[PDB]
Design a protein around this ligand. Structure first.
Ligand code: 8OG
Ligand SMILES: OC[C@H]1O[C@@](CO)(O[C@H]2O[C@H](CO)[C@@H](O)[C@H](O)[C@H]2O)[C@@H](O)[C@@H]1O
Ligand code: MN
Ligand code: NA
Length: 129
């Protein structure tokens, strides 16, 4: 079974909205809503990975961010460790830089069923803010 370290950014604006993208139909966790992010590469740290991933996926540079949650989840065919970074300050304006759908979503309106099941406790904890 594949093992992966994944860094993702919870991008929260001043209006308690989160920038959420939707995964491609032919990807793992196809069509799911997601926090932008991706695999931590060899030779880079989790903090460096979330910066690089958000630059690649949505065109922002996170700064002064914090680790909101770290958890592990066993999917049917892979084991992933997810690093959820809370990103409240950044340079740039997030957009669908890789052609993917992206939009701002109110925190209170998030439905954990729309996300990969690994995100369940994080979406709950975000609504506790
Ligand atoms: N990018 C991202 N990936 C997630 C989230 N939740 C989650 O289980 N994953 C999983 C889906 C993929 O198996 C893997 C990410 O790899 P890619 O983003 O490179 O597809 O992590 C999330 O919120 N954002
Ligand atoms: O791990 C994040 C954690 O560390 C602090 C300092 O105690 O922030 C530092 O690390 C962040 C991630 O690299 C940087 O963005 C930040 O600039 C740096 O001070 C905490 O703020 C944070 O909770
Ligand atoms: Mn990704
Ligand atoms: Na990516």
């Amino acid at each position: 079974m594949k093992k992966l370290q994944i860094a993702v950014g919870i991008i929260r604006n001043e209006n308690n909205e989160i920038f959420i993208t939707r995964r491609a139909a032919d990807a793992h966790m196809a069509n799911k809503l997601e926090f932008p992010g991706g695999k931590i590469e060899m030779g880079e740290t989790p903090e460096q990975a979330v910066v690089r991933e958000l630059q690649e996926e949505v065109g922002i540079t996170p700064q002064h961010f914090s680790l909101f949650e770290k958890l592990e989840y066993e999917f049917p065919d892979r084991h992933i460790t997810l690093w959820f970074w809370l990103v409240e300050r950044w340079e740039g304006e997030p957009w669908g830089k890789e052609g993917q759908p992206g939009e701002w979503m109110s925190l209170v309106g998030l439905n954990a069923d729309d996300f990969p099941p690994a995100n369940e406790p994080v979406i709950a904890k975000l609504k506790r803010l």
